Design a protein around this ligand. Structure first.
Ligand SMILES: Cc1cc2nc3c(=O)[nH]c(=O)nc-3n(C[C@H](O)[C@H](O)[C@H](O)COP(=O)(O)OP(=O)(O)OC[C@H]3O[C@@H](n4cnc5c(N)ncnc54)[C@H](O)[C@@H]3O)c2cc1C
Ligand SMILES: CCCCCCCCCCCCO[C@@H]1O[C@H](CO)[C@@H](O[C@H]2O[C@H](CO)[C@@H](O)[C@H](O)[C@H]2O)[C@H](O)[C@H]1O
Ligand SMILES: Cc1cc2nc3c(=O)[nH]c(=O)nc-3n(C[C@H](O)[C@H](O)[C@H](O)COP(=O)(O)O)c2cc1C
Ligand SMILES: Cc1cc2nc3c(=O)[nH]c(=O)nc-3n(C[C@H](O)[C@H](O)[C@H](O)CO)c2cc1C
Ligand code: FES
Ligand code: FES
Lengths: 251, 446, 198, 408, 204, 387
């Protein structure tokens, strides 16, 4: 073997492979993001209750009925920006636009919070009926993310759905059980003193109670994770001020 | 003073009374052929031939130059051949007194003989077979020399004789044998002994080392491990006190000395004692009228590492200095394992027998249990005084591994050193034969 | 500095590549027969991983990260080829300039010396490093811990198999089936650290 | 599109950088040495073809071959090399052939040794003396069903450096041979024509080499006599493909051109005084005749000797005049024979059946010391096992059972 | 004839004899969807890599042979990964790392070194297809038991009703973990070597 | 039948080689002496399991509802038919009978199901039926909650006997603990029936938390026996009045039983000493460093000892001769590693409230490594001609 031939062979092989690889990885860059957006849009539609069995109609239903919007947690007011392309995970990760929570107030054990969050308003025409709030916190094995859709009065929940979790199936992975998620409808999030009134009680809650929710059987650690998630995100450091503005009207 | 902390003084009944008395007249001897390791005989004699004392019976093909001679003068009667025509024993009927006579030396001149002049006389007389080389326990090569010779001179076997009684009769012969061995060694002669006094040789090559403790203290393997560790590059010769007396008598008088003082003792013997006998005698007529009635097993050696003396092998071995007799146990017993035995022996504390201190048992030949797999509860580590890993070495031997057994230390050991490990094994394994097979494989892969 | 200690112990025990992520089994099950050879291969893997991870971190941070070289361009699709090229070149260097030119590791490195290139553990470690977004020192410590954990697992398996010389396995399960079952039992035992929050 | 060009350029640059690093590292370390091996000290022949790698690829290229057989890999282990300087590593495949003792003095196989650094060798003297030749065929006449004897003449009067019982490595260039012209005596016409055996043919594309043993003895110098067997499909399974090289040598005629490559040998006779027992079968007459003639006519030995042979019928025997004359000349040498299934016209009397069985029931059972005499066996592999079992049951050590076999 | 494509299914099975590709077998066998997608991906990658390496087998210098082969194999794996992300995003989200780990799959390198470099392109392609089939056999067989007994489903369809949904079956939690894969592969090897004794290993 | 005489009787063989006299100990006697050691623990466990069920049932129900419950479960109506009573003042007779009806089915199922595979393998491979299953079956039946389903116990013992023990070659050949391997199979496969507050007290509709996991919630002040309303003290947790399995509840009985087999030399004291040393060292380090949000950082050694299956594991399950180390130098390390791992799993790992069974399985992997280290040191000492 000689260098004169080896370099030529290597360069020719690289020139043969690279055009194919780059064209494949650049041509599909639009579909690779459409597929990613479709999952979130479908989950938001499912939480809002709109039925869309197909990526063809999911796009139009989400574009017409759902309006993403940014919210500033410190001020509890709307912010103008590219909400349809926001990235909450990286926004919280970056120290430029995030707050390092301290131990005594990091109830959800998320250790970082973003300065500005994103909420989705479900509306027809220009009248809004719901608002979908994304909340998350620590479980036992992994982070648990969820969407909670509250009514326009700021108190009544109209559905809870967990779209990302890694608990043990059948034992602590029952957060995705429809029998458990279907009981959150009609529950109330606040009391007359504006305290977080959601309580994941153990062993069962009184039937018809407006603040009690059945806990997971044999999954007390995950139930405590959910309780911490709500105690944080409904508190002062979360959607507290935003819901305070919401219950006064003008959502 | 070297003290051994681990071991087991076997409390078997019928301990002999250390008083030497004349034995029965012996009209038949034999020189065995299955006790010499790797010995392939070339028979120079035939049935009906008349042999003088110290006249060669057969040579070796694997160890050229080594000659085995006849203990007494008589007529050959049997050349018994076992399976695959293996030599079991050569039987000689003592019917004469003629002999072959060798050279004589003054007692003063025995410390300055040439090594070759000593070797020639030893090999011609047939006492060269008394030595054994550790490792492999083979008879030393004719032209080989080692710098450490271990004169045992102590006996700790069950129902064994006391060397101090035997030696004090032959003090001059013992001293002359020590002088000859000191001139022959080229290294040192390690005269192992207990705390008692023995005749002393006025030579710088001869050392008296005092041991102590239970049984394994009186083993040439233990003496080598504690005074001169052995390996493939360092072989050490071994010999007992009676063969040293024989060497001394040979070099003092010019005639081979084929007497013995063995201990006839056991649980089923009417009067245990030390009986003066002849080398390679016939045990069947040595132990007649000395045994209680019933089925018995006659052993040529200690019950831990002896040989059953039945049929062609019913003759005294070369390296054995005691005859042990004990009853045969064949009957079954219902729920014997669940009995809280008062008459049952064990190194563990799971029987009521160990509570009674000083008890002596009428032990039999039964294997208390059946063959099973090895569950190491820690019995071998209680009875191995050497610096080894016993329950790893025995698993290595059982698995058939040879190189790892060598690394763990199988070379320094012999079948007589694993007798206690076989004795205390819940799995009823025999480790001496496994070690012998391993050493044969090692020798062949040379 | 407690962060580096936590990273090291996490990589060694909590996230053991061989028995928690299960990467490298094609050699983990095949070469583990003697502790000497297993220790030699573990040392080789340690060295290769420790040298491979930081270089890939430097390259990914410099040129392959989105928007890192020129704003508006994203070359995160060359990750596989770049990582495998770096790993292969490092393994070739180790095999050909140092291992055999100096006193060689005879029978410690045989057919399995060029198999380090296609060892899944190194590529898995680089990919996980890319996902976790470590710094340079964290990358070094992560590589060292991963290598030490892999060596620990392979040496434990080698010791178990050496102990298994006394076993009596059925003829069908001789060697490979029993190796699979033994590795399964070891993985079952290694689930003590599953829930640790380190 | 601007990302495509960046990706292409960066792929090319990264791969070029990696390849250049590898090439530069190789250029900074490669020894580029040559002539790194000396086969011995005294001879001037210390030249090879390759600077390293495998050892045959350097020695056979320069003309040195203990036995550079086809393929290699130590499947037969005649490529014997002795080393005294260099790497002491042993291939896992070499522990099977080399004991630890020979390993300490450095004995290995050639198709396993890998050369990279300086060394010196201590090859045996037989390598320096072996050579090819140009022997012409004299006779290839058949004397049995499957046995042919080949007679050759050495050119220019040279004598091969051989000992009793050796073997020369015969060659066979590319050829195509048909069985059509094969013809045997009238008695063998029956069983030969029962399948007729002439439809068979062989294809040879390149020269091939196997070995044969000499039926002659050193005082018959100037003429090479061999015992050649034909390789035919087994009678029970005629659909098995036949043999190539044996068929080619069968096709050889008188006056034909032939080339031997050199004599090699094992299975020599011991220089002791014990009794000698020669046992064989099939084409094994060659080493036994060589040994018998050596010890009797050349060495003038007076050791008691017996040559026990087994056959199938009286028609299956040859060399009978030779062995009878030798037995009449020498009182110490007596040879016996047995027939497996004698025919009514054979007029046979005496021993019958398997050779090991007749041996045991007639001679060794009454023998006083069957463990001191020496045994030499060279015959059918199925007789090998029976004779080995019989001798081991009689109790004979491995050092006294000297045998030569062709690997079944 | 079809001996090249049919033999490595049982006669020369990669995982069963060569011990190649076991990591993906332990990983992606939890669900038949991912198992089948992985089988197809490895089949295509192995076949095409063998084809190209055999096409250029003459002009590969010894010094950079590994680089030359890895360029082709990594390019193929990158193309496959981009295609999976574009069209099978739901499946590609689950495989994750074990899609990029196709390059370090030992089957691909073993068949490239042993057969592709020294065989004709079409025989190399056929051998790659055969090895991929032999690998997929083990993948799908292990995945069948794992999915059916750990989640009571098959290909995502309901077969055994679960106790949490008003059925009768209580799912086994070990099937969704790794040791079940080890045990299943071990018992597969036992059964295969029982039915085909010629593959049994020696005591020594 | 021959399957009984060959068990009761001794074979009545004689020696034919090497040591003509043998020790009286044998594997049958070893296994039987170990099998009898857990009898006091088993009897107190049955008593306590009856008592807890009676107390919880009386606390929950009363009167007509109590009668309806008692007539709906076969344990309760069998106890009532056999002369016992489920009233609040039931005696030790009924408290033991209920535990017996809860334990005996599990033991019978485990014994039969494991023995089937034992006999099948030892018959196919042409061996004689060994022993040691007499220990494995009873230990497995003692280390499981009283409410475990029979169809789960059968699978657990099947896995433990076949995969962990019988595949490797049987008794004396395996490398892992069979009973703990089966229990770990159950623990990871069916975690709802071996964890939670519903499984320890064998009462219908009563949920009572683990005594060990009541500490992680609030500390020593959170230990309370909801069945009776009293608080668990150290004496209660030592004697064995806490809810739990049949076997490891009582610690005084475990010490009494294990003292005999330690004295007789069957169970090594080195492993027990190592476990004790490791537990004491680590659980004192945790107290010294302290913590605010974790309540198990303040649990001392004498509270680690009594609670959970620590005593049962250390005495009867950590001293398995086959799985443990073969060197007196490595037995100490094996024990120390067992204790350290158990304390670590208890304290730092939040998913598993009890970790003795996983600590033993972890140390079973690394015992051969310690053996290899000691043997390599011994070989390096031998090469210097000093051994
Ligand atoms: C040192 C030495 C000396 C020897 N001396 C002699 C001697 O003096 N005289 C003598 O006759 N022999 C001798 N032999 C035996 C030697 O093998 C001869 O060469 C013999 O004639 C065999 O012929 P061959 O080597 O050409 O066989 P080959 O042609 O190499 O092999 C063909 C044989 O294999 C069979 N075969 C081929 N292909 C297959 C297949 N696919 N399936 C099944 N079977 C198949 C054929 O039927 C035939 O039996 C000697 C061997 C050695 C090692
Ligand atoms: C057979 C017995 C063999 C073992 C012998 C004894 C070994 C014990 C060694 C350490 C002695 C003290 O052991 C242990 O110490 C710690 C403090 O360090 C005490 O700890 C106590 O005070 C600390 C103060 O910070 C509290 O957080 C903790 O909850 C409380 O228990 C324990 O109550 C005591 O049990
Ligand atoms: C293997 C295993 C996995 C478990 N996984 C979870 C889990 O993912 N989420 C959870 O809340 N509890 C899980 N648990 C149970 C907890 O460890 C703990 O016992 C339980 O949450 C407490 O139950 P309780 O307080 O409601 O009685 C698991 C238990 C085991 C044995
Ligand atoms: C002290 C002692 C403890 C034992 N512990 C166990 C145990 O925990 N589990 C088990 O299956 N067998 C146990 N056995 C039985 C036996 O030793 C075990 O099956 C071996 O591992 C053989 O497989 C024990 C035996 C003894 C003597
Ligand atoms: S061909 Fe025999 S060693 Fe090479
Ligand atoms: S196949 Fe070898 S690492 Fe995965």
């Amino acid at each position: 073997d000689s260098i004169k031939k080896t370099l030529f062979v290597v360069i020719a092989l690289s020139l043969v492979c690279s055009i194919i690889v780059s064209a494949a990885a650049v041509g599909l860059r639009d579909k690779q993001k459409e597929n990613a957006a479709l999952d979130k849009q479908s989950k938001i539609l499912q939480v809002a209750g709109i039925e869309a069995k197909g990526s063809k109609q999911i796009v139009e239903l989400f574009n017409k009925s759902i309006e993403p919007r940014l919210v500033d947690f410190n001020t509890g007011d709307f912010v103008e920006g590219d909400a349809a392309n926001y990235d909450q995970r990286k926004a919280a990760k970056e120290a430029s636009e995030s707050i390092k929570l301290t131990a005594e107030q990091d109830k959800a054990k998320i250790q970082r919070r973003a300065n500005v969050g994103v909420v989705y308003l479900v509306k027809d025409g220009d009248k809004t009926s719901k608002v979908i709030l994304p909340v998350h916190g620590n479980g036992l094995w992994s982070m648990m993310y969820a969407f909670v859709a509250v009514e326009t009065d700021g108190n009544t929940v109209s559905g809870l759905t967990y779209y990302e979790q890694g608990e043990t199936p059948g034992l602590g992975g029952e957060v995705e059980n429809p029998a458990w998620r279907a009981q959150w409808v009609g529950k109330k999030l606040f009391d007359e003193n504006h305290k977080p009134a959601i309580k994941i009680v153990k062993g069962g809650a009184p039937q018809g109670s407006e603040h009690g929710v059945d806990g997971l059987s044999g999954a007390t650690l995950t139930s405590n994770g959910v309780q911490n998630t709500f105690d944080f995100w409904l508190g002062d450091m979360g959607f507290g001020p935003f819901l305070t503005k919401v219950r006064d009207g003008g959502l | 003073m070297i003290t051994i902390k681990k071991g087991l003084d076997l409390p078997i009944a019928g301990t002999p009374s250390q008083v030497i008395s004349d034995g029965k007249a012996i009209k038949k001897v034999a020189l065995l052929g299955e006790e010499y390791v790797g010995m392939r005989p070339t028979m120079h004699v035939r049935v009906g031939d008349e042999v003088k004392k110290a006249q060669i019976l057969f040579e070796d093909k694997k160890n050229p130059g080594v000659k085995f001679t006849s203990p007494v003068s008589g007529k050959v009667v049997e050349i018994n051949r076992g399976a695959k025509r293996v030599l079991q024993s050569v039987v000689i009927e003592v019917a004469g007194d003629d002999q072959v006579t060798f050279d004589k030396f003054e007692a003063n001149q025995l410390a300055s003989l040439n090594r070759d002049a000593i070797k020639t006389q030893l090999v011609e007389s047939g006492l060269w077979t008394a030595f054994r080389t550790r490792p492999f326990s083979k008879v030393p090569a004719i032209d080989s020399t080692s710098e450490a010779i271990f004169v045992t001179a102590m006996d700790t076997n069950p129902l064994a004789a006391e060397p101090t009684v035997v030696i004090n009769e032959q003090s001059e012969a013992f001293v002359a044998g020590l002088d000859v061995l000191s001139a022959l060694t080229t290294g040192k002669v390690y005269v192992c002994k207990k705390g008692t006094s023995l005749p002393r040789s006025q030579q710088p090559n001869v050392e008296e080392h005092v041991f102590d403790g239970p049984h394994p203290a009186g083993l040439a393997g233990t003496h080598m491990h504690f005074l001169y560790p052995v390996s493939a590059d360092h072989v050490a010769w071994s010999i007992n006190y009676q063969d040293v007396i024989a060497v001394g008598q040979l070099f003092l008088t010019g005639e081979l000395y084929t007497q013995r003082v063995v201990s006839l003792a056991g649980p089923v013997v009417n009067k245990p004692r030390l009986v003066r006998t002849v080398m390679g005698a016939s045990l069947e007529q040595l132990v007649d009228s000395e045994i209680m009635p019933g089925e018995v097993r006659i052993i040529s050696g200690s019950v831990l590492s002896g040989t059953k003396a039945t049929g062609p092998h019913a003759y005294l071995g070369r390296y054995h200095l005691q005859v042990s007799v004990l009853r045969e146990g064949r009957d079954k017993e219902l729920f014997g394992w669940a009995m809280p035995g008062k008459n049952k022996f064990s190194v563990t504390r799971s029987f009521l027998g160990h509570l009674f201190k000083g008890q002596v048992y009428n032990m039999t030949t039964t294997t208390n249990g059946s063959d099973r797999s090895m569950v190491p509860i820690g019995n071998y580590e209680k009875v191995m005084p050497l610096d080894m890993e016993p329950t790893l070495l025995l698993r290595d031997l059982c698995a058939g591994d040879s190189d790892s057994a060598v690394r763990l230390g199988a070379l320094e050991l012999d079948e007589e050193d694993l007798a206690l490990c076989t004795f205390v094994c819940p799995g009823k394994y025999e480790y001496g034969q496994l070690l012998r097979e391993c050493l044969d494989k090692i020798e062949k892969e040379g | 500095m407690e962060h580096y200690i936590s990273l090291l112990v996490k990589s060694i025990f909590i996230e053991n590549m061989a028995l928690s992520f299960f990467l490298g089994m094609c050699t983990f099950l095949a070469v583990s027969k003697k502790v000497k050879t297993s220790f030699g291969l573990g040392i080789a893997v340690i060295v290769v991983l420790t040298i491979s991870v930081p270089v890939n971190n430097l390259v990914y941070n410099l040129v392959l990260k989105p928007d890192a070289l020129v704003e508006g361009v994203d070359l995160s699709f060359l990750n596989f080829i770049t990582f495998i090229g770096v790993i292969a070149a490092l393994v070739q260097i180790l095999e050909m300039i140092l291992d055999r030119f100096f006193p060689p590791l005879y029978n410690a490195l045989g057919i399995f010396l060029p198999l380090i290139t296609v060892n899944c553990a190194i590529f898995g470690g680089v990919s996980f490093m890319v996902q976790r977004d470590y710094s340079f020192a964290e990358s070094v410590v992560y590589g060292f811990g991963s290598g030490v954990g892999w060596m620990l697992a392979i040496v434990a398996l080698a010791g178990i198999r050496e102990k298994m010389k006394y076993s009596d396995v059925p003829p069908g399960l001789r060697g490979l089936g029993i190796t699979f079952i033994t590795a399964g039992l070891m993985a079952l035992g290694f689930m003590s650290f599953s829930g640790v929050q380190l | 599109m601007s990302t495509i060009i960046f990706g292409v350029v960066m792929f090319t640059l990264i791969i070029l950088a990696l390849v250049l690093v590898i090439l530069f590292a190789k250029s900074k370390l490669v020894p580029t040495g040559d002539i790194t091996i000396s086969i011995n000290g005294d001879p001037e022949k210390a030249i090879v073809t390759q600077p390293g790698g495998k050892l045959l690829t350097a020695l056979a290229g320069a003309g040195v071959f203990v036995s550079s057989a086809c393929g290699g890999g130590g499947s037969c282990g005649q490529c014997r090399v002795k080393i005294k300087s260099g790497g002491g590593d042993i291939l896992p495949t070499e522990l099977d052939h080399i004991s630890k003792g020979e390993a300490r003095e450095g004995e290995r196989l050639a198709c396993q040794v890998a050369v990279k650094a300086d060394m010196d060798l201590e090859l045996p003297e037989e390598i320096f003396g072996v050579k090819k030749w140009e022997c012409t065929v004299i006779s290839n006449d058949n004397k049995a069903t499957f046995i042919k004897e080949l007679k050759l003449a050495i050119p220019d009067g040279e004598s091969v450096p051989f000992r009793a019982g050796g073997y020369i490595q015969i060659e066979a260039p590319a050829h195509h041979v048909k069985y059509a012209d094969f013809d045997v005596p009238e008695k063998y016409r029956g069983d030969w024509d029962k399948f007729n055996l002439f439809r068979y043919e062989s294809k040879v594309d390149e020269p091939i080499i196997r070995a044969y043993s000499m039926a002659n003895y050193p005082e018959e110098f100037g003429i090479i006599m061999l015992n050649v067997r034909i390789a035919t499909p087994p009678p029970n399974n005629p659909n098995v493909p036949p043999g190539q090289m044996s068929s080619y040598i069968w096709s050889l005629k008188a006056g034909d051109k032939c080339t031997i490559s050199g004599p090699f040998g094992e299975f020599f006779a011991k220089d002791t005084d014990a009794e000698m027992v020669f046992i064989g079968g099939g084409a094994g007459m060659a080493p036994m005749r060589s040994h018998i003639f050596d010890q009797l006519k050349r060495l003038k030995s007076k050791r008691k000797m017996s040559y026990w042979y087994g056959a199938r019928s009286k028609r299956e025997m040859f060399y009978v005049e030779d062995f009878d004359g030798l037995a009449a000349e020498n009182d110490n040498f007596v040879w016996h024979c047995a027939l497996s299934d004698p025919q009514p016209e054979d007029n046979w009397t005496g021993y019958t059946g398997f050779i090991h069985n007749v041996l045991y029931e007639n001679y060794l059972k009454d023998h006083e010391a069957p463990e001191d005499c020496e045994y030499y066996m060279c015959g059918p592999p199925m007789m090998n096992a029976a004779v080995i079992n019989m001798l081991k049951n009689l109790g004979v050590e491995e050092e006294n059972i000297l045998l030569d076999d062709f690997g079944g | 004839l079809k001996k090249s494509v049919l033999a490595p299914v049982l006669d020369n099975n990669p995982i069963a004899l060569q011990v190649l590709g076991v990591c993906s077998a332990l990983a992606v066998t939890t669900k038949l969807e991912t198992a089948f997608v992985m089988t197809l991906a490895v089949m295509f990658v192995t076949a095409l890599s063998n084809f190209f390496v055999s096409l250029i087998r003459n002009h590969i210098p010894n010094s950079v042979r590994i680089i030359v082969q890895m360029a082709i194999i990594a390019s193929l794996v990158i193309v496959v990964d981009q295609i999976l992300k574009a069209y099978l995003y739901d499946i590609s989200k689950q495989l994750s790392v074990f899609v990029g780990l196709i390059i370090t799959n030992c089957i691909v390198m073993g068949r490239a070194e042993a057969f592709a470099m020294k065989s004709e392109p079409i025989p190399s392609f056929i051998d790659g297809i055969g090895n991929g089939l032999g690998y997929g056999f083990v993948l799908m067989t292990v995945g069948f038991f794992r999915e059916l007994l750990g989640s009571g489903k098959l290909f995502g369809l309901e077969v055994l009703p679960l106790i949490s949904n008003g059925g009768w079956y209580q799912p086994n939690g070990l099937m969704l973990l790794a040791p079940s894969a080890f045990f299943l592969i071990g018992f597969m090897i036992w059964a295969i070597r029982t039915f085909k004794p010629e593959q049994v290993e020696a005591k020594e | 039948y021959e399957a009984a005489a060959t068990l009761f009787y001794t074979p009545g063989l004689v020696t034919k080689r090497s040591s003509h006299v043998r020790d009286s100990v044998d594997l049958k006697r070893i296994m039987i002496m170990v099998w009898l050691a857990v009898f006091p623990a088993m009897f107190w466990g049955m008593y306590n399991a009856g008592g807890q069920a009676i107390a919880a049932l009386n606390h929950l129900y009363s009167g007509d509802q109590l009668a309806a419950i008692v007539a709906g479960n076969w344990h309760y109506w069998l106890t009532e038919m056999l002369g016992g009573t489920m009233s609040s003042d039931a005696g030790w007779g009924s408290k033991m009978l209920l535990g017996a009806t809860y334990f005996l089915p599990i033991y019978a199922t485990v014994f039969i199901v494991g023995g089937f595979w034992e006999v099948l393998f030892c018959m196919v491979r042409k061996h004689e039926v060994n022993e040691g299953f007499f220990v494995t079956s009873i230990l497995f039946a003692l280390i499981v909650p009283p409410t475990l389903p029979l169809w789960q116990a059968a699978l657990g013992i099947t896995f433990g006997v076949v995969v962990a023990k019988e595949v490797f070659g049987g008794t004396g050949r395996n490398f892992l603990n069979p009973a703990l391997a089966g229990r770990a199979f159950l623990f990871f496969a069916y975690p709802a029936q071996i964890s939670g507050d519903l499984v320890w007290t064998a009462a219908d509709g009563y949920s009572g938390a683990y005594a060990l996991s009541q500490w992680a919630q609030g500390g020593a002040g959170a230990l309370i026996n909801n069945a009776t309303g009293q608080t668990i003290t150290w004496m209660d947790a030592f004697i064995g009045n806490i809810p739990g399995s049949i076997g490891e509840v009582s610690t005084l009985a475990l010490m009494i039983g294990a003292a005999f087999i330690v004295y007789m030399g069957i169970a090594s004291w080195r492993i027990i000493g190592g476990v004790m040393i490791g537990m004491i060292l680590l659980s004192t380090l945790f107290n010294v460093i302290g913590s605010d949000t974790n309540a198990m950082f303040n649990m001392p050694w004498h509270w680690h000892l009594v609670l959970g299956g620590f005593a049962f594991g250390m005495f009867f399950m950590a001293t398995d001769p086959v799985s443990a180390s073969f060197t007196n130098s490595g037995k100490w390390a094996y024990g120390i590693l067992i204790g350290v791992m158990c304390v670590l799993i208890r304290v730092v790992n939040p998913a598993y409230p009890e970790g003795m069974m996983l600590a033993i399985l972890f140390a079973n992997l690394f015992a051969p490594l310690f053996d290899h280290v000691v043997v390599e040191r011994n070989i390096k000492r031998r090469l210097a001609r000093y051994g």
